[PDB]
Amino acid sequence: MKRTFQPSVLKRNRSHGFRARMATKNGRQVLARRRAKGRARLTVSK
Amino acid sequence: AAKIRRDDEVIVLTGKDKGKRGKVKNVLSSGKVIVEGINLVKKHQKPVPALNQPGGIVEKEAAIQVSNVAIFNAATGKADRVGFRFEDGKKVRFFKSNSETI
Amino acid sequence: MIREERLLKVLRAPHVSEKASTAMEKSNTIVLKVAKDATKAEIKAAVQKLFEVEVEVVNTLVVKGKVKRHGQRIGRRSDWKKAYVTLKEGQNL
Amino acid sequence: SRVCQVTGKRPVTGNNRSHALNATKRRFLPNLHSHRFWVESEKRFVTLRVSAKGMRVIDKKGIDTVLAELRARGEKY
Amino acid sequence: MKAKELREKSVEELNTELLNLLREQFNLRMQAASGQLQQSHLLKQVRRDVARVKTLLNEKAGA
RNA sequence: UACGGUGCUGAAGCAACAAAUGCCCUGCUUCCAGGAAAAGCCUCUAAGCAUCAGGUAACAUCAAAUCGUACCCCAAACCG
RNA sequence: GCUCGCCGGAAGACCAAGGGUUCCUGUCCAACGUUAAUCGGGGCAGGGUGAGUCGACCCCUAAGGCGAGGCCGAAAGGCGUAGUCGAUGGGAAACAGGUUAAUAUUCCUGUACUUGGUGUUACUGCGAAGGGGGGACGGAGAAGGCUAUGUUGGCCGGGCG
RNA sequence: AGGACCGAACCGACUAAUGUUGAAAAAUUAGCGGAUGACUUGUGGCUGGGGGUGAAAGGCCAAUCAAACCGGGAGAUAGCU
RNA sequence: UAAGGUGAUAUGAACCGUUAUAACCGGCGAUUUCCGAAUGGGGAAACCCAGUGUGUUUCGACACACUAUCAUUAACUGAAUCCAUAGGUUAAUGAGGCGAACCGGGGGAACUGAAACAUCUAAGUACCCCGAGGAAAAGAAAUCAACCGAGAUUCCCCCAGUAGCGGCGAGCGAACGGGGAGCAGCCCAGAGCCUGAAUCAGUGUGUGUGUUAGUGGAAGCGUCUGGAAAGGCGCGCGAUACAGGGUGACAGCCCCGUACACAAAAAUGCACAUGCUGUGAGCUCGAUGAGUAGGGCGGGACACGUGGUAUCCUGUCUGAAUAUGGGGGGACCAUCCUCCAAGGCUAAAUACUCCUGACUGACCGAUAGUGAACCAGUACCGUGAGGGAAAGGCGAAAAGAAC
């Protein structure tokens, strides 16, 4: 049937993307925590 | 800095046949030196296009460690160690036990 | 003073050199591998200068890279841009 | 914000102690009112957020001195 | 020091740069992708020579 | 002919009837629940400029760059 | 290759999303494929995606988002004017035939069309976050005129079963 | 004209049988209701956790809901096993 | 510095080079696409689209620089409204952002314990936010002390689980005083004699010492077993080196090094007789920090829960004396003693480790030690924040098995 993930790249970059994280102070802290752990993918928008 | 250089008559201290004396052909960076007729390896070479086309079992020189060989003095028939002493950048190598520039 | 001839390093490989390229040559066009940021005007000017041919139009496309690498370690080849250079009048080749 | 602009008074946090000494956090807020003050030297009315203690120090020290203190602090009018 | 480049210290190196890049690196690139033998070292030599000319231009703005 | 596919030639190529949920139709009639905005476009002026600029028409020429383009096309390539 | 069966308002064909090389050619069959595999959407190389007209970009907005100043808030921050973004909506222009193993409104052949710049000639009052027009709009129902398209006949080539 | 009637697409889910280590972490096959409207669907957007939203069922808020998920307090505490 | 190099998996090809010029190391410069504080505007990061100024007798057009915002300052302008003011433009300077911990401030839980729970505790902890510096904070007595005196802050050890606080339960818990580390005090509330007078900053090529390249560096041979001696045996040698690693087994004398001695074009960091500039010594007299101290109300901090409760802070309302003075000595009064708030700066002792270098380990040795010895915050899961693995070893040398 219809499942929880129905993909859309525009919604994905608008919600979980780099500039969505960069607009907020809290999402900037999110990007800082990912950078501190060492992840190759800081954001899944790429 | 290099006690054993590219063209030097060297005598084997340890390993395989010690008494054999050979000339250096090549000095590799892993601390290993290639001397003519010292370590003989019989390598089975596969027939392949371009280089090594006939194949066959080939006798070639294997690398010997540079610490297992010593330079041979012509004046005294023995292995004698290497030092450097000269005031400028091109330090000359000297045979110890004879104090003569190699 | 000569114009921006240093910018005309855009042309990279003399041919892609395949069957589509050779049949397209038998019609009118040379197929070339050109930069990544090269524009059609620069490909026109570069071909007209580096070779003596006076050219008609340039059609361009980007060939995306193929993965072409195994399961344990995965890689991607580089993207490259291909120019079909139309040469109906005065073609040396 | 609720800053006195003359005496630097901010909302300070404390407790609402009960008869059973139960403690719930509360904010003491200043007596802040917008007041229009006449400056005779500059011939104008300056609109200042000011506490009651601020009005008291304005009549004590003059409006010019409080304004000069604000210029020295760097606060705008 | 390793390499002495007193030869490149001269005025108007633009023509030498155009010689080193234009037709030289270009025909080396064309012959390299078609297939030729010595270009493996010639391309590296031409690239380092262009680097020498451009470094000397950035040193001497007047030339 | 390895069956792919090439070179050449190529007859007739009309009429009547029935036809949509498609076009006329952003129409017409009727109803009440009363049916986006801004630009492109047309037109008129303000500042300004007056043999200028600008506009219109014709002709001629030049330019239209960059990115996608294969494939899956309600599914063995999407979500499961 | 010859029969048989199935779908045929699809189990046929095409756009969008989404995937990303799964498309084409050659070679291989260890692993994957619920079997074997010579086969494959599998491995490995090499090809292939050609645009002024098709989308994007772009010009303009909607819901909405951000929002210099500004108002407010203990700090973070909340809201909001000018404005600036945001298609799912409104702005220029291409169709038939052929082509490759793989691309086609792109390549070729034929016939077009649009929007700017410049030059020439001729004529002339032109000119803006300004005004107006315009874009510019609902539901249902009913003809009528057609067309896509089909049948039948005429014509043409073949058959004489 | 009709929150009109019969009925496909479409939306839903009334009964039965099969499945229940399934073909499927709610489906299949026969029947069933609505089907010009309080209808349906695509694309964006807005509402955020003792809060939202609810033609109201403790329903829904990513197979999670009488207070989601993720990290921290945290090695909470556990007279219990 | 060098006889060898073009990083590794990863060989091959094509070459470069003989120490006097190939690689390698170090100092200094050049270039440094795009995104990212992103800074010309926008954006769904790594893309879309501009403006201004400089360069087609090449009528395709290209290259370069600048243009974000905020604060301070100056200029030029400039409304309602006359003078003004708000605003607008230009120029300069600074700020953005990141970072593991330490430090200061603004807020601030609950599980839990009390064998329930509400005062209390957990705790000003976890967390969020702001700010700063290599440290930060504090700091020069309106302090303690007791008729003796000590003499700024900060950290350690006692006092001492003491005195007290407390549903006087749970539990919280000092100070006086003594021993140590380290030990500078100053300046403005203002005038006359002095304007690098001694400091303090900026600022130097001077001198010394370090750091970032390096150089030299001693002394072993016979014989046995073995595939191989570093081991066994015999006879020696160096030792300011017998730290360590490697070499075909266990090497002081085989190789890197090691004790020891030396070296730095250049760039820097410290210290100083020091090279320049500006503030600023000291004398004399005058001042002695008011919406402040204090009080009322409500709260917070002091070990101190409002109690008998001194001290400190202020949200609200009030409100002095002004050196004849005022504060403190734990309700309060008298006496006595001590000290001058309502203005600031101040080094060391103290805290921490993202990073560098050496050394050390009764630390681990591939289910261990970091999650990660290994191409690991990767594969893989999830919309996302986030979670998150397994996986070392041929041999001395590939001699990696021709036929």
DSSP string over E9-56: -SS-THHHHHHHIIIIIHHHHHHHHH--STHHHHHHHHHHHHHHHHHH
Q: Where are the domains of chain A?
A: 1-46
First-to-final CA distance of chain C: 31
Chain G bases near protein Cβ (<7 Å): 17-21, 43-52, 66, 72-77, 87, 100-102, 106-108
**What is the distance between the alpha carbons of residues C69 and C47, in angstroms, rounded to a whole number?**
34
Q: Give the neighbours of chain C: at least 3 Cβ pairs within 8 Å.
A: E
Q: Can you tell me whether residue C70 is helix, strand or coil?
A: coil
Provide the CATH topology of domain A1-46: Helix Hairpins (1.10.287)
How far is Cα B20 from Cα B73, in angstroms, rounded to an integer?
Answer: 14
Q: What is the resolution of this structure in A?
A: 3.2
| Cβ A20 vs Cβ A14: under 8 Å | yes
Nearest nt to D18, CA vs C1'? I119
CA E49 to chain centroid: 3
Count of structural domains within chain E: 1
Closest-CA distance, E5 to chain C, in angstroms, reads 23
Q: In this structure, what token pair is assigned to residue C35?
A: 């930069």
Geometric angle at alpha carbon C77, from C74 and C83, rounded to 5°: 160
Q: Which residues pair with D39 in a beta bridge?
A: D44
For residues D34 and D26, the answer to whether their CB atoms sit within 8 Å is no
With a CB cutoff of 8 Å and minimum separation 6, the contacts of D36 are D45, D46, D47, D48
Question: Own/partner pairs for D35-41, CB < 8 Å, 24+ apart?
Answer: D37/D63, D38/D63, D39/D63, D39/D64, D39/D67
User: In terms of Cα–Cα distance, which of C61, C53, C3, C62 is closest to C28?
Assistant: C53
Could you say which DSSP state residue B37 is in?
A: T
> Which of E30, E50, E54 would best serve as a mutation to test chain C binding (most C beta carbons within 10 A)?
E30
For residue E56, give its domain range: 2-61
Strand F contact at CB of residue C60, distance < 7 A: yes
Nearest nt to the C69 alpha carbon by C1': G44
Q: Which domains are delineated in chain D?
A: 1-77 (2.30.170.40)
- State phi, psi for E2 to the nearest 5 degrees: -120, -50
User: Would you tell me the crossing angle of helices D52-61 and D63-73 to the nearest 10 degrees?
Assistant: 110
Cβ(B33)–Cβ(B69) below 8 Å: yes
Neighbours of C45 (CB within 10 A): 19
What 3-state DSSP class applies to E57?
helix
